[PDB]
Each structure stands twice: as structure tokens, then as C-alpha cells.
């Protein structure tokens, strides 16, 4: 988990992680859903 919640969507992400977050605009950062 990088940013606030995970990988910010860059356009995309590592795979189909649950968003918890989000970086600069809308890069909606994703996260692993067995992650809490």
C-alpha cells in the first residue's frame, strides 16, 4: 500500500484491487481486498 490506500490509478493497477484511497486527481488508489 503506497499512497493514501494503495497504487493510485494510474489508468490502470497491479490487477483488480479494491479502491481505499485516491492520489492526485482522481488516480483512485487501489488496494488488495484482503488488506482490510
Same mark, same amino acid.
Given at each position: !500500500?503506497?499512497? #493514501? %490506500? &494503495?497504487?493510485?490509478?494510474? &489508468? %490502470? +493497477?497491479?490487477?483488480? !484491487?479494491? #479502491?481505499? &484511497?485516491? +492520489?492526485? &486527481?482522481?488516480?483512485?488508489? +487501489? #488496494?488488495?481486498?484482503?488488506?482490510?
Amino acid at each position: !500500500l503506497f499512497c #493514501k %490506500g &494503495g497504487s493510485c490509478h494510474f &489508468g %490502470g +493497477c497491479p490487477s483488480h !484491487l479494491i #479502491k481505499v &484511497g485516491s +492520489c492526485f &486527481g482522481f488516480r483512485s488508489c +487501489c #488496494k488488495w481486498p484482503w488488506n482490510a
